[PDB]
């Protein structure tokens with residue numbers, strides 16, 4: 577029975593390797609990865625892979641791995657797929673830990689923009705969770721040299737993490753990770769999957785996919801939001817993506833809003849993640 581080696585980059589940066597039967601559905605590999613991680617609240621997570629255009633794609637657990645990776649390597653990353661709006665309602669601390677690891681990478685990568693103060697706060701909770709109480713003996717030295725807190729480190733940022741770390745004496749790891757998440761969940765780009773697009777007039781916009789719906793960034797002034805319950809149908813055609821909106825109260829007709837994506841693969845990818853968000857957050 578012929579098996580393919582799978583390599584999975586975990587949220588701690590380490591590499592998990594296993595073999596699956598070459599005709600395996602994605603769920604088979606996902607189940608092995610979640611068991612490795614001791615993760616029971618699996619619904620929030622998924623595996624990603626890179627397509628022939630080096631674009632990130634979700635591995636569909638209900639489809640054959642070979643029909644998704646196609647001619648590429650069986651190389652994946654383990655990621656948060658659906659960011660919970662209220663991480664306090666997750667049943668397990670370890671779920672919250674993996675969500676923290678993902679958000680830490682969202683922050684360092686610059687996908688999740690964050691003020692100086694919130695970068696320092698988040699870093700101070702991570703340090704408290706992983707090292708425990710601030711050692712007053714270290715006083716001015718760098719016991720935090722290995723922690724990456726931001727896309728760009730400054731001495732001022734390091735100083736501020738240490739000042740806030742001192743304030744968390746007695747805080748336990750699940751408590752510190754919960755405070756991390758209570759701050760991170762409030763960030764305007766928390767859990768937003770961003771896609772470059774153009775409106776029906778050709779103006780460059782971004783489409784954000786999240787719990788709260790489909791967001792439109794036209795620039796820093798004039799945003800828009802389509803809450804999922806309003807969205808009746810999501811579709812794609814060639815390089816175009818469409819949402820059909822419920823008729824408003826007293827309105828005769830539905831509305832369809834069209835967007836141009838960078839190519840056909842990009843329209844199909846946006847369609848799939850929107851449909852998946854719409855389902856997940858309808859049920860949650």
Ligand SMILES: COc1ccc2[nH]cc(CN(C)C)c2c1
Pocket residue numbers: 787788804805853854855857858859
């Ligand atoms: C906020 O996420 C959603 C997405 C689609 C939905 N369709 C119906 C609902 C009902 N929900 C408000 C309980 C919904 C929610």
